[PDB]
Write a protein that binds this ligand. Structure first.
Ligand SMILES: Cc1nc(Cn2cnc3c(N)nc(N)nc32)cs1
Length: 167
Protein backbone atom coordinates (compact mmCIF):
# COMPACT_ATOMS: atom_id res chain seq x y z
CA UNK A 1 0.00 0.00 0.00
CA UNK A 2 1.12 3.60 -0.79
CA UNK A 3 -0.46 7.09 -0.57
CA UNK A 4 -1.38 7.58 -4.27
CA UNK A 5 -5.11 8.15 -4.98
CA UNK A 6 -7.43 8.63 -7.99
CA UNK A 7 -5.24 6.92 -10.60
CA UNK A 8 -6.23 5.07 -13.77
CA UNK A 9 -4.39 1.73 -13.90
CA UNK A 10 -2.65 1.28 -17.25
CA UNK A 11 -0.59 -1.86 -16.61
CA UNK A 12 0.68 -3.97 -13.73
CA UNK A 13 3.06 -1.16 -12.69
CA UNK A 14 2.04 2.08 -14.49
CA UNK A 15 -0.70 4.45 -13.28
CA UNK A 16 -1.83 7.85 -14.64
CA UNK A 17 -3.78 10.88 -13.41
CA UNK A 18 -4.72 14.37 -14.64
CA UNK A 19 -2.77 16.47 -12.13
CA UNK A 20 -0.26 19.29 -11.77
CA UNK A 21 2.93 17.60 -10.53
CA UNK A 22 3.46 20.30 -7.87
CA UNK A 23 0.01 19.89 -6.29
CA UNK A 24 0.26 16.11 -6.59
CA UNK A 25 3.67 16.05 -4.86
CA UNK A 26 2.64 18.34 -1.96
CA UNK A 27 -0.32 16.07 -1.23
CA UNK A 28 1.47 12.69 -1.35
CA UNK A 29 4.97 13.65 -0.22
CA UNK A 30 6.25 10.66 -2.24
CA UNK A 31 9.62 9.10 -1.58
CA UNK A 32 10.71 10.11 -5.12
CA UNK A 33 9.46 12.84 -7.43
CA UNK A 34 10.94 12.92 -10.94
CA UNK A 35 12.02 16.24 -12.41
CA UNK A 36 12.06 16.68 -16.19
CA UNK A 37 15.55 18.22 -16.06
CA UNK A 38 18.12 19.46 -18.54
CA UNK A 39 21.82 18.58 -18.40
CA UNK A 40 22.68 21.87 -16.64
CA UNK A 41 19.95 21.47 -14.01
CA UNK A 42 18.75 24.95 -15.01
CA UNK A 43 15.12 24.76 -13.80
CA UNK A 44 13.50 27.40 -16.01
CA UNK A 45 10.14 26.08 -17.16
CA UNK A 46 7.90 23.07 -17.60
CA UNK A 47 8.09 20.66 -14.70
CA UNK A 48 11.52 21.90 -13.54
CA UNK A 49 10.51 25.55 -13.24
CA UNK A 50 7.30 24.61 -11.41
CA UNK A 51 8.97 22.23 -8.91
CA UNK A 52 11.83 24.65 -8.36
CA UNK A 53 9.42 27.55 -7.71
CA UNK A 54 7.56 25.39 -5.17
CA UNK A 55 10.87 24.87 -3.29
CA UNK A 56 11.43 28.66 -3.07
CA UNK A 57 14.51 28.18 -5.36
CA UNK A 58 16.21 25.75 -2.94
CA UNK A 59 16.22 23.12 -5.71
CA UNK A 60 18.15 25.52 -7.97
CA UNK A 61 20.67 26.40 -5.23
CA UNK A 62 21.34 22.71 -4.56
CA UNK A 63 21.52 22.01 -8.31
CA UNK A 64 24.07 24.76 -9.00
CA UNK A 65 26.37 23.30 -6.32
CA UNK A 66 25.91 19.83 -7.88
CA UNK A 67 26.89 21.10 -11.36
CA UNK A 68 29.83 23.13 -10.04
CA UNK A 69 31.23 19.92 -8.51
CA UNK A 70 30.24 17.29 -11.10
CA UNK A 71 29.64 19.04 -14.42
CA UNK A 72 26.59 18.48 -16.58
CA UNK A 73 24.51 15.34 -16.79
CA UNK A 74 24.22 13.28 -19.97
CA UNK A 75 21.09 13.35 -22.07
CA UNK A 76 19.41 10.13 -20.94
CA UNK A 77 21.05 10.36 -17.51
CA UNK A 78 19.96 11.34 -14.02
CA UNK A 79 21.04 12.30 -10.55
CA UNK A 80 19.38 11.99 -7.14
CA UNK A 81 19.13 15.19 -5.11
CA UNK A 82 16.92 16.38 -2.27
CA UNK A 83 13.15 16.50 -2.71
CA UNK A 84 13.01 19.59 -0.45
CA UNK A 85 9.37 20.24 0.61
CA UNK A 86 7.95 18.10 -2.22
CA UNK A 87 9.37 14.57 -1.64
CA UNK A 88 12.13 12.78 0.16
CA UNK A 89 14.22 12.73 -3.03
CA UNK A 90 14.10 14.31 -6.45
CA UNK A 91 15.32 12.16 -9.33
CA UNK A 92 16.43 14.68 -11.99
CA UNK A 93 16.09 12.84 -15.32
CA UNK A 94 17.18 14.29 -18.67
CA UNK A 95 15.05 13.13 -21.56
CA UNK A 96 15.95 14.20 -25.10
CA UNK A 97 14.71 17.68 -25.96
CA UNK A 98 13.39 17.49 -29.53
CA UNK A 99 13.52 21.29 -29.76
CA UNK A 100 17.25 21.06 -29.04
CA UNK A 101 17.74 18.46 -31.83
CA UNK A 102 18.55 15.67 -29.33
CA UNK A 103 18.04 11.98 -30.30
CA UNK A 104 14.55 10.68 -29.29
CA UNK A 105 16.04 7.15 -29.04
CA UNK A 106 17.54 8.46 -25.79
CA UNK A 107 14.04 8.56 -24.28
CA UNK A 108 14.24 4.85 -23.41
CA UNK A 109 17.59 5.40 -21.67
CA UNK A 110 16.04 8.26 -19.70
CA UNK A 111 13.16 6.08 -18.48
CA UNK A 112 15.59 3.30 -17.46
CA UNK A 113 16.69 5.56 -14.59
CA UNK A 114 13.26 5.01 -13.01
CA UNK A 115 14.06 1.32 -12.47
CA UNK A 116 16.51 2.24 -9.69
CA UNK A 117 13.54 3.32 -7.51
CA UNK A 118 10.71 1.10 -6.29
CA UNK A 119 7.99 3.81 -6.47
CA UNK A 120 7.99 7.21 -8.21
CA UNK A 121 5.72 10.16 -8.92
CA UNK A 122 6.68 11.39 -12.37
CA UNK A 123 5.70 13.50 -15.37
CA UNK A 124 5.78 12.27 -18.97
CA UNK A 125 9.42 12.77 -20.00
CA UNK A 126 10.26 14.79 -23.14
CA UNK A 127 6.58 15.91 -23.59
CA UNK A 128 5.32 19.52 -23.41
CA UNK A 129 8.09 22.05 -24.24
CA UNK A 130 10.63 19.25 -24.86
CA UNK A 131 8.77 18.67 -28.17
CA UNK A 132 8.32 14.87 -28.27
CA UNK A 133 5.02 13.07 -28.83
CA UNK A 134 3.39 12.38 -25.42
CA UNK A 135 1.62 9.27 -26.78
CA UNK A 136 5.09 8.00 -27.67
CA UNK A 137 6.56 8.95 -24.30
CA UNK A 138 3.78 7.07 -22.49
CA UNK A 139 4.40 3.96 -24.62
CA UNK A 140 8.15 4.07 -23.95
CA UNK A 141 7.44 4.48 -20.22
CA UNK A 142 5.16 1.43 -20.15
CA UNK A 143 7.64 -0.64 -22.17
CA UNK A 144 10.71 0.42 -20.14
CA UNK A 145 9.83 1.07 -16.50
CA UNK A 146 9.32 -2.05 -14.37
CA UNK A 147 9.02 -0.32 -10.99
CA UNK A 148 5.80 1.35 -9.82
CA UNK A 149 5.33 4.68 -11.57
CA UNK A 150 2.53 7.17 -10.97
CA UNK A 151 2.36 9.55 -13.93
CA UNK A 152 0.84 12.99 -13.75
CA UNK A 153 -0.37 14.82 -16.89
CA UNK A 154 -1.34 18.46 -16.19
CA UNK A 155 -3.06 19.32 -19.50
CA UNK A 156 -6.62 17.93 -19.36
CA UNK A 157 -7.03 17.73 -23.13
CA UNK A 158 -3.73 15.86 -23.41
CA UNK A 159 -4.76 13.53 -20.56
CA UNK A 160 -7.99 12.67 -22.40
CA UNK A 161 -6.08 11.96 -25.64
CA UNK A 162 -3.54 9.73 -23.85
CA UNK A 163 -6.22 7.59 -22.18
CA UNK A 164 -8.38 7.14 -25.26
CA UNK A 165 -5.42 6.20 -27.49
CA UNK A 166 -3.68 3.79 -25.10
CA UNK A 167 -3.44 0.20 -26.39
C1 LIG B 1 9.15 19.31 -20.15
C2 LIG B 1 7.94 18.53 -19.67
N1 LIG B 1 6.75 19.19 -19.48
C3 LIG B 1 5.75 18.25 -19.08
C4 LIG B 1 4.34 18.69 -18.83
N2 LIG B 1 4.20 19.59 -17.71
C5 LIG B 1 4.49 20.91 -17.66
N3 LIG B 1 4.16 21.40 -16.47
C6 LIG B 1 3.64 20.37 -15.75
C7 LIG B 1 3.11 20.26 -14.46
N4 LIG B 1 3.04 21.36 -13.55
N5 LIG B 1 2.66 19.09 -14.06
C8 LIG B 1 2.72 18.04 -14.85
N6 LIG B 1 2.21 16.82 -14.36
N7 LIG B 1 3.20 18.04 -16.07
C9 LIG B 1 3.66 19.24 -16.53
C10 LIG B 1 6.27 16.94 -19.02
S1 LIG B 1 7.86 16.88 -19.39
Amino acid sequence: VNSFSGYLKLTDNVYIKNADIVEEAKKVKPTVVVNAANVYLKHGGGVAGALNKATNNAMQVESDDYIATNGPLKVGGSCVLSGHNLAKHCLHVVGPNVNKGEDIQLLKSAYENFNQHEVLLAPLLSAGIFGADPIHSLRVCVDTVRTNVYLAVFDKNLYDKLVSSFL
